[PDB]
């Protein structure tokens, strides 16, 4: 009751001392010799103009042409971004959806929200219509994120402070990841899909092993709830966007914060983060109604994506890196190049 | 310049757009109400006349109502409370008999203060329901209101106590200009609660319409 708390304090002391010992040079003084990327000019190439309420999530397909967007009018829309055509429009059973996923194979999409259920939709049916393939139940809080591992495995994060790995064939929870003391708001799968990171409301991000299930590392430094998380393309780092108007780059191998992406003018939380194809650009969606793009190695604003009349709620970059898509609380998606 | 398949895909997209517009027009004719309370406050008893979120549908005078009872959402309220920014009104239910102990009405006023003075619900009117008026009368006949309210200069009569409780809930509103609180001392009674909600919703809709044409 007391010796356990004292022992835990000693472990935190040891962890922080080791982290400080391994901190011999910040990458600010290491990358200072590089020439900055300069001003970044992106323009709204497309404006997807079908939704009628707040857009809460969006996900690019692996083909870098199809994207799915979830909005609060209870509609899942699949867009042909090249031509702004609506491939599908899926009516959701529950209008309250906060997350949306696109299967890497492209055969499925996932949705979830305040109904505490992750619903899998089959896109390629012989009937020609999109049918719900399975409703995954078992979360006791709202669903905040979901990411497909393959056609049969999907990992979901919920507001009940737990992340779960599902088996869509049977609909059961293969693994449960319980180490968070606050609602898990974001999720990001490693490029090799052997790990994933989750950012919760306790201002901490955790690295999990999907194969068996345990928090390998815990990353702190944020002063408020973490709303967004994204893996570096290398897979050895990740970025977090939180409510304290800052983005931080953490390092898996060094087990430390690397850089902080903050500015005095920005005082709003971050709703979404994503990296560019090479990882040199970090794009974050803010409550200032606009998205900032940062030099991931220099930590300075390389540009601004200002085209939305409300808060930018979702944001993603294509697999080939050709474009970024931002959804806002105004019912529009915009593709920037 | 499009091919035959491209033209057919554009036609399918147009059909999808038409369906989306029709469903949006149908949805915009519904009144969305957020039902809030402290559990035993009487939300179920308010609902009776008509694992995540709960939706209840009912019709009154050719008007369709959708009531969302968040209820068993034991998460951080500020994480998902912005989802309901845009509901027509908020139905807040409190139990007048919750001044006994376990202070419970103090939690009710805390929740009312948090919801009313929320950045998302800046201009959404609140329909306040004060359930259990007969239980309130029975409790007042023996226990006083001083136990829950440290300062109170009034006789142990139902009328004065209820008026003071209504006033003490109403002054918690800080944005008294842009938002109106409608109070109804509800009970089992008859279908007067639905009529009160309809009147309040009609007032809110009239204000919204005046905002749309820009003379409010």
């Amino acid at each position, epitope marked *: 009751l007391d010796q356990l708390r004292q022992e835990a304090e000693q472990l935190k002391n040891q962890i922080r001392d080791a982290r400080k010992a391994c901190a011999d040079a910040t990458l600010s003084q290491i990358t200072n010799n590089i020439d900055p990327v300069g001003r970044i000019q992106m323009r709204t190439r497309r404006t997807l103009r079908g939704h009628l309420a707040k857009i809460y999530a969006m996900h690019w397909g692996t083909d870098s042409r199809l994207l799915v967007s979830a909005s609060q009018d209870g509609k899942l829309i699949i867009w042909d971004s090249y031509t702004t*055509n609506k491939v599908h429009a899926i009516p959701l059973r529950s209008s309250w959806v906060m997350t949306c996923a696109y299967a890497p194979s492209g055969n499925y999409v996932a949705c979830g929200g305040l109904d505490n259920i992750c619903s899998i939709y089959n896109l390629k049916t012989r009937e020609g219509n999109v049918r719900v393939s399975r409703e995954l139940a078992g979360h006791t809080g709202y669903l905040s994120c979901c990411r497909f591992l393959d056609d049969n495995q999907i990992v979901t994060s919920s507001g009940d402070t737990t992340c779960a790995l599902w088996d869509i064939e049977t609909g059961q929870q293969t693994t449960t990841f319980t180490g968070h003391t606050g609602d898990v708001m974001s999720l990001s799968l490693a490029p090799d899909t052997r790990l994933f990171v989750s950012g919760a409301c306790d201002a901490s991000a955790k690295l999990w092993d999907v194969r068996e299930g345990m928090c390998r590392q815990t990353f702190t430094g944020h002063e408020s709830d973490i709303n967004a998380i994204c893996f570096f393309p290398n897979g050895n780092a990740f970025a977090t966007g939180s409510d304290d108007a800052t983005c931080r780059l953490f390092d898996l191998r060094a087990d430390q914060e690397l850089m902080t992406y903050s500015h005095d003018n920005i005082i709003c939380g971050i709703t979404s983060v994503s990296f560019s194809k090479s990882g040199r650009l970090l794009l974050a969606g803010y409550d200032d109604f606009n998205c900032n793009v940062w030099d991931a190695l220099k930590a300075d604003r390389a540009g601004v994506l200002a085209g939305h009349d409300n808060r930018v709620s979702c944001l993603g970059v294509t697999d080939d890196g050709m474009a970024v898509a931002t959804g806002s609380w105004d019912s529009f998606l915009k593709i920037w190049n | 310049t499009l*091919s035959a398949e491209d033209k057919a895909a554009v036609e399918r997209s147009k059909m999808i757009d038409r369906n989306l517009r029709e469903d949006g027009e149908k949805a915009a004719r519904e009144v969305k109400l957020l039902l809030l309370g402290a559990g035993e406050s009487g939300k179920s008893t308010i609902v009776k006349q008509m694992t995540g979120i709960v939706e209840t549908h009912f019709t009154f005078k050719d008007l369709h109502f959708k009531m969302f009872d968040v209820g068993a959402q034991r998460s951080e309220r500020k994480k998902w409370i912005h989802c309901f920014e845009g509901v027509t009104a908020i139905i807040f239910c409190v139990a007048l008999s919750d001044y006994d102990l376990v202070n419970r009405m103090h939690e009710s006023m805390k929740l009312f203060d948090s919801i009313c003075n929320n950045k998302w619900f800046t201009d959404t009117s609140i329909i306040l329901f004060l359930n259990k008026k007969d239980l309130f009368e029975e409790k007042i006949k023996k226990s006083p209101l001083t136990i829950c309210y440290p300062e109170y200069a009034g006789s142990n009569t139902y009328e004065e106590a209820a008026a003071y409780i209504q006033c003490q809930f109403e002054d918690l509103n800080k944005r008294k200009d842009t938002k109106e609180i409608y109070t109804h001392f509800t009970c089992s009674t008859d279908t007067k609660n639905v009529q009160f909600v309809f009147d309040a919703v009609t007032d809110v809709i009239i204000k919204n319409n005046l905002k749309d044409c820009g003379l409010f």
Partner: single-chain antibody
Amino acid sequence: DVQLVESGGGLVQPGGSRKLSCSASGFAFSSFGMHWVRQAPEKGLEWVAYISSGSGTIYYADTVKGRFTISRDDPKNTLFLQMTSLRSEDTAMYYCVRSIYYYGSSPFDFWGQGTTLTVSSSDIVMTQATSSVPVTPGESVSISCRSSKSLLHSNGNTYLYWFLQRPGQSPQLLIYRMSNLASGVPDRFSGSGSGTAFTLTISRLEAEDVGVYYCMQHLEYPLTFGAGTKLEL
């Protein structure tokens, strides 16, 4: 499952006005564009009429324009072909192909069983050269097809479709847009080719593969089929 039953056949005196019906049962008929494709007693397939989902677009072949009338009736999933002034050239078997059009879709995937109607007594030329080649099980055969016009479009996809008509049943889609393999088709079938030159290769050919193979153009209407390449032995 997906079904398309044809009714309204029989023997018609010339100048008659017999109507053809096709009832769909097993798929979202309202979202599928429908086609009528006729087949003469011994000739190959010939496109007739097309009505899109929602009936907003209708196309006819020049041979039947002004005499045939196609129409859907969505509530109970029936497709009609009102034909008037029937001539001896209309003696054929009529199919009720369904085709849905979006990005990545496979049009012409399902064909009806067909009903036989007997009448008493600038388009792209899609050339299939050879009409019948002898094959043996376990071998590989490349069926060739040529187009008068380049089927490659600015979108980057060449609109050429491959169909197989096994003896005694309706044609089935094998390859759509000259590369993609249709769902349910074994991976042995492979499609390839460039503008105005397309081939279909059946690696490790065996039984239940004999029949006529038709190469079809979907670049723009009227849709034109090849003569058809017969596979026997």
